[PDB]
Ligand binder design. Structure first.
Ligand SMILES: O=C(Nc1cccc(Cl)c1)c1ccccn1
Lengths: 52, 150, 93
């Protein structure tokens, strides 16, 4: 699963950033963020900051 | 300000030798076998730099504690010795609680969710302990008991 | 064992709250309250490690040491706040 089938002859290794697509045939990166402003595991620091 | 500059020089030195890369390529953790969730985002703030900062803070805390226990003979008007030692110990406890959770979750998921959150929580807890149990008794005496203010 | 330790400690610090207010004759009252407060801080800081270090690379090498350090600190606060002033007074005379 670390490689994507670029051609029917053999699978090809994808770059360090992208991960293989669900139905093979290439790979596309999916960006992520540092929790953004979401509720999970951010309410506690935000509260201890605002009340402080 | 001289004490601040003593660490500001080191901050500048570390900034120069080790610039803030802020690389988005934080793919060190990679669950590529399921190929479902992968990737991470984090600043380049180093664990060694954090350790150096905490060491400087702990040294300052030790000097504060030795000073507090040296100046214990001051009367009750300026007796800022027991609260200061208590605050030093509370900050030490907070940082000693921060160390295991921060330095143990290395080869595990949600490393960004754990490390940054626990670091900022520890910083906020130390600041809250210091501010509250340093000044809040005084504010209480001032504006809740207007009789000892003279 | 941890829960029974916190139970004994909670009764101890509850008796310490009612202790607060006694005259200066009882020398070992305010130090007792301070020791209870320090133990309160230590055991309140211990729990985040307890429910935070789980599901990590080292689930065994940190759980057996965090409790050990907490126990050592809970002994050290009592030692320092109940015998260090006694030792200092002894050194005076
Ligand atoms: O876990 C703690 N302190 C620590 C710090 C570094 C390494 C290790 Cl083994 C332990 C701790 C501190 C305070 C209260 C409860 N627990």
């Amino acid at each position: 699963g670390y490689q994507y089938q670029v051609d029917r002859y053999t699978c090809k290794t994808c770059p360090y950033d992208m991960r293989p697509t669900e139905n093979r045939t290439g790979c596309r990166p999916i960006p992520i963020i540092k929790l953004e402003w979401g509720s999970p595991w951010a309410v506690l620091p935000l509260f201890l900051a605002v009340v402080g | 300000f001289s004490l601040i500059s003593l660490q500001l020089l080191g901050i500048c030195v570390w900034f120069v030798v080790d610039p803030s890369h802020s690389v988005v390529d934080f793919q060190d953790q990679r669950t590529l076998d399921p190929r479902f969730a992968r990737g991470v985002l984090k600043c380049d703030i180093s664990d060694l730099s954090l350790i150096c900062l905490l060491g400087y803070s702990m040294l300052l805390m030790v000097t504060c504690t030795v000073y507090a226990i040296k100046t214990r003979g001051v009367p009750e008007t300026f007796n800022e010795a027991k609260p200061i030692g208590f605050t030093m110990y509370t900050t030490c406890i907070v940082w000693l609680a921060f160390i295991p959770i921060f330095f143990g979750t290395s080869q595990s998921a949600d490393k960004l969710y754990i490390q940054t959150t626990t670091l900022t929580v520890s910083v906020s807890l130390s600041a809250s302990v210091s501010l509250g149990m340093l000044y809040m008794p005084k504010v209480y005496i001032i504006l809740f008991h207007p009789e000892q203010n003279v």
